[PDB]
Amino acid sequence: QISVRGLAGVENVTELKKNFNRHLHFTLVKDRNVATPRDYYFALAHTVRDHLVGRWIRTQQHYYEKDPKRIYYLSLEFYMGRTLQNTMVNLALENACDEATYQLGLDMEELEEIEEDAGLGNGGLGRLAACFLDSMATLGLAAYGYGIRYEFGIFNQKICGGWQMEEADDWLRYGNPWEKARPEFTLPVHFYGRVEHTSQGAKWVDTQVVLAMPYDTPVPGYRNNVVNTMRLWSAKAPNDFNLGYIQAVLDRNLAENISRVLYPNDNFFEGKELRLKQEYFVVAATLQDIIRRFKSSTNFDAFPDKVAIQLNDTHPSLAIPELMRVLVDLERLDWDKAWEVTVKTCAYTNHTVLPEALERWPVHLLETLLPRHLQIIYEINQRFLNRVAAAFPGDVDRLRRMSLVEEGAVKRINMAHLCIAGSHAVNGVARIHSEILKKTIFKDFYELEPHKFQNKTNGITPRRWLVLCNPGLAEIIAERIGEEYISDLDQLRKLLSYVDDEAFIRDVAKVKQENKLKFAAYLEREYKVHINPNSLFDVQVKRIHEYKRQLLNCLHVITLYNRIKKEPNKFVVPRTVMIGGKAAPGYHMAKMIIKLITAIGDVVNHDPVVGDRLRVIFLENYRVSLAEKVIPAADLSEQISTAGTEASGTGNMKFMLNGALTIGTMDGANVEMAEEAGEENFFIFGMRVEDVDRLDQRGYNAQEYYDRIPELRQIIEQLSSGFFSPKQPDLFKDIVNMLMHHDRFKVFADYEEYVKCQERVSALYKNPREWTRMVIRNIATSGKFSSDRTIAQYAREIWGVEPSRQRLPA
Numbered sequence: 001q002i003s004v005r006g007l008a009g010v011e012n013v014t015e016l017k018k019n020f021n022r023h024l025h026f027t028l029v030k031d032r033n034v035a036t037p038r039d040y041y042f043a044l045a046h047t048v049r050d051h052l053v054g055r056w057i058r059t060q061q062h063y064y065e066k067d068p069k070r071i072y073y074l075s076l077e078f079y080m081g082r083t084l085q086n087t088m089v090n091l092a093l094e095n096a097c098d099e100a101t102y103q104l105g106l107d108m109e110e111l112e113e114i115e116e117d118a119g120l121g122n123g124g125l126g127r128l129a130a131c132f133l134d135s136m137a138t139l140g141l142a143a144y145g146y147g148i149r150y151e152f153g154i155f156n157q158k159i160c161g162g163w164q165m166e167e168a169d170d171w172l173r174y175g176n177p178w179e180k181a182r183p184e185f186t187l188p189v190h191f192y193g194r195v196e197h198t199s200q201g202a203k204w205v206d207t208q209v210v211l212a213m214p215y216d217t218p219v220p221g222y223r224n225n226v227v228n229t230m231r232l233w234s235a236k237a238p239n240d241f242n243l244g245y246i247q248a249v250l251d252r253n254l255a256e257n258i259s260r261v262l263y264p265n266d267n268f269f270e271g272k273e274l275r276l277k278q279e280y281f282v283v284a285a286t287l288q289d290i291i292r293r294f295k296s297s298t299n300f301d302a303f304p305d306k307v308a309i310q311l312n313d314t315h316p317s318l319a320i321p322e323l324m325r326v327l328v329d330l331e332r333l334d335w336d337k338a339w340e341v342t343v344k345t346c347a348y349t350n351h352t353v354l355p356e357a358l359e360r361w362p363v364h365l366l367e368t369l370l371p372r373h374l375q376i377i378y379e380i381n382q383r384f385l386n387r388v389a390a391a392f393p394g395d396v397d398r399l400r401r402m403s404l405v406e407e408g409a410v411k412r413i414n415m416a417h418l419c420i421a422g423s424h425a426v427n428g429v430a431r432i433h434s435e436i437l438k439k440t441i442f443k444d445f446y447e448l449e450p451h452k453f454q455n456k457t458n459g460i461t462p463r464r465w466l467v468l469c470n471p472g473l474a475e476i477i478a479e480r481i482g483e484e485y486i487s488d489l490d491q492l493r494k495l496l497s498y499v500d501d502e503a504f505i506r507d508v509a510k511v512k513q514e515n516k517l518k519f520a521a522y523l524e525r526e527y528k529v530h531i532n533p534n535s536l537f538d539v540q541v542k543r544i545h546e547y548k549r550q551l552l553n554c555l556h557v558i559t560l561y562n563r564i565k566k567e568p569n570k571f572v573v574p575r576t577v578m579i580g581g582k583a584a585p586g587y588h589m590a591k592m593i594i595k596l597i598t599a600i601g602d603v604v605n606h607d608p609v610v611g612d613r614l615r616v617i618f619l620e621n622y623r624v625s626l627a628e629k630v631i632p633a634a635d636l637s638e639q640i641s642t643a644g645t646e647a648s649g650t651g652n653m654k655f656m657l658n659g660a661l662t663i664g665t666m667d668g669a670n671v672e673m674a675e676e677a678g679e680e681n682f683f684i685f686g687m688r689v690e691d692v693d694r695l696d697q698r699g700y701n702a703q704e705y706y707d708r709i710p711e712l713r714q715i716i717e718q719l720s721s722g723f724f725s726p727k728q729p730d731l732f733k734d735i736v737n738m739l740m741h742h743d744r745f746k747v748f749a750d751y752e753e754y755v756k757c758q759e760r761v762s763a764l765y766k767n768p769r770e771w772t773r774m775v776i777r778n779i780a781t782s783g784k785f786s787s788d789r790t791i792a793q794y795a796r797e798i799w800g801v802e803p804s805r806q807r808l809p810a
């Protein structure tokens with residue numbers, strides 16, 4: 001059908017068809033007479049999977065012979081989404097499979113919709129890990145993703161009476177064709193127990209044992225025949241566990257609960273024992289696997305030359321004292337040498353500056369669960385603080401500020417401090433974020449060891465986030481500049497010479513309209529809701545949080561509604577406002593925000609005077625597969641976090657690559673995006689970081705804004721009096737109270753500029769030609785935000801390895 005989707009050769013199509021029929025018969029034990037769409041999906045998945053295995057075995061063989069430095073990316077989250085189409089794209093199989101299935105009388109796009117998302121993450125941090133795995137394979141690095149195979153991923157979100165309801169994400173119900181269980185490589189993990197001191201050092205004894213069973217999933221590079229591995233650990237009880245009889249067998253569930261469920265919190269720390277167990281489980285099993293592989297190449301001096309461990313936030317921070325434990329207690333290395341190895345091996349990436357998101361574990365928890373690790377942490381702390389004292393003599397407050405141990409009612413360990421101490425590199429995820437780290441929360445550490453601190457601006461994979469989800473746009477780009485940009489996104493700059501090209505302008509606008517029509521149809525077919533495809537698609541999709549300010553968006557929506565009600569027969573640019581994302585189950589305010597959005601929709605969508613000029617839709621169950629649908633359809637991307645709160649954002653980059661314009665604050669990666677495209681081509685508004693600081697020093701008074709802005713006053717009065725909740729007039733009292741008396745994120749402070757900026761958006765949208773020309777300038781300068789660039793920087797500046805675009809033999 002289209003160029004970028006590969007060749008459909010006679011030989012390939014014939015071979016695909018027969019292997020599809022083989023799997024249906026032998027693997028699924030079905031015939032065409034009883035087969036369902038689901039059976040057809042699985043036959044296709046198995047057929048494509050077969051094409052991976054040869055490459056997978058030969059890639060891993062290649063690494064064994066060449067013995068390169070290995071990269072271990074440790075994360076508690078891998079937000080993978082669907083795998084079928086991604087695999088076809090990276091193997092150049094999409095058109096061939098499309099043809100093969102067509103000839104069998106099947107629609108492949110229908111089959112693709114059957115696959116469950118692998119939802120083993122919450123949002124941005126989990127998705128970054130997934131994009132990173134794709135780029136590492138594409139860049140030919142010997143890289144392994146290590147995590148937990150959760151039985152239940154992020155919950156499925158249902159909306160009932162405007163409220164979020166959670167249901168279990170039973171993603172393994174029908175099986176996972178992409179994983180391979182590896183029970184032969186099962187490893188033991190220890191918990192509890194006590195420490196004994198002997199003449200021959202410390203020993204950790206009387207422990208409870210949980211088995212870690214690995215499951216391997218292939219990670220194909222883009223058309224380079226490289227297939228890397230994501231290894232996810234599953235918890236298993238040992239066979240003598242608790243071994244009246246029946247109860248002892250039933251009690252095995254206690255051990256196996258470790259890998260049962262993903263903690264559903266975005267940017268928020270919950271200090272529960274089960275979570276700590278998950279963190280150690282992944283770390284202990286992973287490190288044994290690493291050391292085993294290293295020994296199969298005595299001398300640990302070469303360890304940092306052959307191993308890099310990247311910590312995705314502090315969640316796997318126990319890798320630091322666990323590596324020390326192994327080197328000191330088991331390999332019998334002296335402390336100083338073990339520490340040198342550890343530091344040179346580990347690197348740490350921070351993803352937030354919000355105080356409530358920082359991991360601070362109660363000492364009493366670590367004392368019971370991991371008694372030896374606590375001892376090691378204390379020793380790390382003592383030695384680190386002796387270094388601080390020597391560098392800054394007499395500075396007693398610096399000592400208490402920098403300590404890994406926090407004093408108070410309950411003593412806690414600051415895991416971020418642990419990570420900085422035990423890593424050779426610490427990075428933030430966008431330039432402004434990395435600067436904030438050096439200037440504020442890690443200032444003391446930057447003063448002691450400035451060389452450790454780096455920036456690595458985030459990126460997204462252009463495979464999933466352009467070629468896969470937006471083939472129409474990928475194709476029109478390929479028509480002009482070729483296909484090489486797919487693995488070299490900087491080449492999109494060549495599109496600047498097409499900004500006054502009348503054919504290209506028409507094609508860019510055509511692709512967007514097609515995307516909007518397709519998405520408008522999706523909403524009717526699957527959710528029975530009517531939208532106008534000619535309206536401006538105004539979208540804010542991401543996890544619900546106060547810092548992300550979905551509430552500011554809400555205020556604008558109501559402002560637009562109130563202005564229409566005031567002057568009904570005045571022309572306004574029609575908008576479809578779409579807001580989606582999940583709230584953490586215990587996050588009350590976020591659940592209230594969802595209810596507000598739906599409540600506004602209930603008033604706005606049924607007002608006859610409004611017509612089809614304004615629609616407010618809550619996008620249910622936002623997840624990777626839904627992102628792939630809505631992002632290509634968007635006209636306006638809402639990136640409106642209070643300056644200084646969104647470390648980077650990655651959703652922003654997805655919208656930029658797919659032809660939406662951005663309205664946003666100068667926060668996270670928005671700053672670099674505007675810098676790349678030109679500020680004239682971005683809708684920037686609101687306080688900068690410096691303005692927020694000035695407001696904090698003076699004291700933020702929300703009443704001031706309420707008093708001086710009549711349009712804002714009206715909205716607050718509407719919310720208070722029960723305009724949006726007639727049956728329950730006080731339903732939104734918590735929201736109003738928060739806004740008026742304890743708003744950490746200064747919603748009112750940016751309201752006027754936001755509304756003004758939104759008017760400028762509507763003005764430009766009235767001129768289709770100039771809207772599209774600005775879009776082209778955005779797409780053309782989005783190259784920096786490829787995760788290929790990001791990973792190349794980690795490789796060269798942190799891991800000390802060279803990326804390669806060279807093919808492995810097929």
Ligand SMILES: OC[C@H]1O[C@@H](n2cc(-c3ccc4ccccc4c3)nn2)[C@H](O)[C@@H](O)[C@@H]1O
Nearest residue numbers: 124125267268351357429646647648649650
């Ligand atoms: O770096 C990738 C993205 O990471 C996002 N993020 C951060 C987190 C996060 C931070 C701290 C946590 C602490 C405990 C549990 C979960 C956590 C998640 N989840 N997502 C950040 O919010 C976003 O700015 C960034 O683009």
